[PDB]
Structures are given as C-alpha cells and as structure tokens.
Amino acid sequence: SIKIKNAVEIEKMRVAGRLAAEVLEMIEPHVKAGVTTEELDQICHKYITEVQGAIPAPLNYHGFPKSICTSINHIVCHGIPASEDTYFGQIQRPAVLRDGDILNIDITVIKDGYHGDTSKMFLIGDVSIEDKRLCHVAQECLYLALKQVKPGVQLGEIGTTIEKHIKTNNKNNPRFKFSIVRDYCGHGIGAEFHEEPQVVHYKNSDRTVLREGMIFTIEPMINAGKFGCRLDDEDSWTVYTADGKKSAQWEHTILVTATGCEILTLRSEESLPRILNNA
Ligand code: NA
Ligand code: NI
Ligand code: NI
Numbered sequence: 001s002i003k004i005k006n007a008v009e010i011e012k013m014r015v016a017g018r019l020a021a022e023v024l025e026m027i028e029p030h031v032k033a034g035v036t037t038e039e040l041d042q043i044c045h046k047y048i049t050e051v052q053g054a055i056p057a058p059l060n061y062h063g064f065p066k067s068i069c070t071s072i073n074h075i076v077c078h079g080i081p082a083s084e085d086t087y088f089g090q091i092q093r094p095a096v097l098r099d100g101d102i103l104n105i106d107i108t109v110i111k112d113g114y115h116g117d118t119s120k121m122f123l124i125g126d127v128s129i130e131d132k133r134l135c136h137v138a139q140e141c142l143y144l145a146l147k148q149v150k151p152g153v154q155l156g157e158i159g160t161t162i163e164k165h166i167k168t169n170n171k172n173n174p175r176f177k178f179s180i181v182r183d184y185c186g187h188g189i190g191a192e193f194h195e196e197p198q199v200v201h202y203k204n205s206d207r208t209v210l211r212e213g214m215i216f217t218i219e220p221m222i223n224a225g226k227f228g229c230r231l232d233d234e235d236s237w238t239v240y241t242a243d244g245k246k247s248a249q250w251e252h253t254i255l256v257t258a259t260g261c262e263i264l265t266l267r268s269e270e271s272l273p274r275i276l277n278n279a
Contacts, residue, residue: 002188002196004213010255012114013190013215017253017264019052020116023068023107025267031122033099037070040105041081044068048109057108057115057193064237069106069119072097076221076229076239076247077106077184088232091240099125102135104249108193115189117217118265119251130224131246133176138222138248141165141201143272145218149210149254149261150278155197156206158186162220163203181221181247183229184239188216189253210256215264219251 005013026047027040045067048054058064064080071079072094082095097103106119121135141162148157163180170177180202188195197208201220225245232238241247255262260276 002208002211002214003190004211005190005215005255006213009114009190010213012112013116013253013255014264016054016109016111016114016116017118018116019048019054019111020107020109020118020253021265021267022052023048023109024105024118024120025269027105028122031097031103031105031124033097033125035097036083037072037079037081037095037097038083040070041066041068044107052109052111055110057110061193069104071104071106071247071249072101073246074241074244076181076223076241077104077249078237078239079104080235080237088234088238088240091230091244093232093235093238097124100127100131102127102131102246102248106251113191115191115193115253116265117189117193117251117253119219119249120267121248121250130176133173134178134222134224134246135248137166137169137176137178138220139250141220141222142218142250142252145220146252146254146261146263146272146276147278149256149276150259151210151212151256153210154206155199155208155210156204158218159200159202159204159206162201166222179223179225179227181223181229182227184219184221186217186219186251188214190215212256212258214256215253217251217253219249221247221249223247
C-alpha cells in the first residue's frame with residue numbers, strides 16, 4: 001500500500017510542495033516579537049486561499065481549528081494559533097512571540113488534490129546559544145537523513161542516521177545534549193495526507209525498501225531535555241515536552257528519484273540542493 005506516483009502525480013506534488021515552501025517564505029517578515037500566532041494564521045490563510053488558490057489541509061480535513069500549526073519553545077508540535085497566552089494546568093500555552101523564542105510554523109497545503117507538507121524554525125530576536133544549537137542540530141538531522149535516500153535503501157537507515165548524529169552530538173557536546181521524540185513520525189504523502197510508510201526518526205531496523213516515485217516526509221523532532229511528550233487534553237492538539245525544555249523540528253516532503261531524492265518543499269534560503277545524487 002505504499003503509492004508509487006506517476007509523472008502527472010509527481011508534477012502535482014511538485015506544485016503543492018513549492019506552494020507550501022512559498023507560504024513559509026511569505027510569512028517570514030511578519031514573524032517577530034509581539035506578533036500573535038493568530039495574526040500569522042490569518043495572513044497564511046488569506047495567502048493560501050486568495051493568492052495560491054490552494055486549501056489549508058488542517059482546517060478543512062483534519063479537524064484542526066486553524067490553517068497552520070504554530071509551535072513555540074517547549075511545544076513539540078500541533079501548537080494552535082491564538083491571540084492570548086493561556087495555560088494547560090501549570091504548563092504555558094503561548095500565543096504571543098517574545099525575544100528569545102523559537103517558533104516552528106508547519107504548513108500543509110492541497111493543490112488539485114495533492115499535498116505539500118513542510119515546517120521550519122524561526123529565531124525570534126536574540127536567541128540563546130543553547131536554543132540556536134537545538135535548532136541547528138535538528139536541521140542537520142533532517143539534512144543528513146536526506147543524504148541517505150535513494151532506491152534500494154531500507155527505511156530504518158533514516159532514523160538510524162538521525163540517531164547516529166544525535167549520539168555523536170551528545171558525545172562531543174556534553175553542555176548541549178539532545179533527545180529524539182518517538183511519538184511522532186514522518187509518513188508517505190500524496191493524494192492523502194497519511195500514506196504508508198511510517199518514517200520513525202530514532203534507530204530502527206525497518207526493512208521497507210525505498211523505490212523511485214515514493215513520496216514521504218522526514219520531520220525529526222529534537223528535544224533539549226528528555227524524549228517524552230504530553231498531549232493537551234483541553235485543546236485536544238498541543239503537544240508539550242514532558243520536562244518543559246524546548247523542542248525543535250524541520251520537515252521536508254521528498255520524492256525518491258533514480259539516484260537520490262528531490263526536496264519538493266525546498267526554500268530559496270536553504271543551501272541544500274533541490275535534487276540530491278546520493279548514488
Ligand atoms: Na518547540
Ligand atoms: Ni507538517
Ligand atoms: Ni508531516
């Protein structure tokens with residue numbers, strides 16, 4: 001049940017991936033201290049629907065109350081845009097950006113029935129060395145995983161490569177040790193948001209062989225403390241680190257090519273090739 005996309009579906013996925021990247025490029029000048037995540041949601045929703053002629057997937061199909069996910073600091077994923085800071089018991093549920101914050105914006109767009117999914121970290125004003133390291137190492141995990149993708153590679157090499165990087169980081173940088181979130185994984189993506197296979201980001205022995213024409217996400221979540229997470233049972237969605245330390249994530253949607261992969265959600269800012277030859 002893993003789908004191999006045909007040429008027409010690959011072109012529809014290329015368009016949807018570029019649109020998802022373009023939302024992130026568009027929103028960047030609006031991301032700064034004193035801005036609400038609700039404001040960012042309004043700007044993205046209007047851009048996606050009126051300029052791109054596309055659909056925000058979370059709002060329309062997944063039961064999410066907003067168009068984008070905005071995850072600040074100790075929020076791991078699925079942060080909900082809002083206008084006011086609130087609390088889940090003793091845990092902060094932030095909505096307004098401050099100097100020193102880190103923010104993940106997660107974009108999922110549909111254009112002519114095909115999905116593009118991507119996310120990136122934004123550094124708000126003067127961020128600490130520990131928080132910059134977290135963001136940077138999380139991106140390195142994604143980039144090193146991409147360098148492993150080509151036909152014939154077993155899926156477990158992705159999480160094994162990510163975990164190798166984090167173990168090396170931890171050995172070499174005892175001041176800045178990280179853990180890998182286990183509860184959330186990457187996934188096949190195409191005409192449906194959730195397709196096979198499941199792509200875990202820690203060390204594993206999944207024997208599923210990558211094939212040209214497969215499209216899936218890689219989206220490692222790295223914690224500054226321990227790996228565990230807590231789900232917000234009041235809003236149903238927000239995921240927090242269980243220990244309250246920060247968490248960072250980057251995501252791309254990628255196509256397996258004959259010799260490597262194509263990064264459908266590549267941004268103009270990234271020094272990563274759109275097409276990797278990993279052969
Ligand atoms: Na976070
Ligand atoms: Ni996403
Ligand atoms: Ni995803």
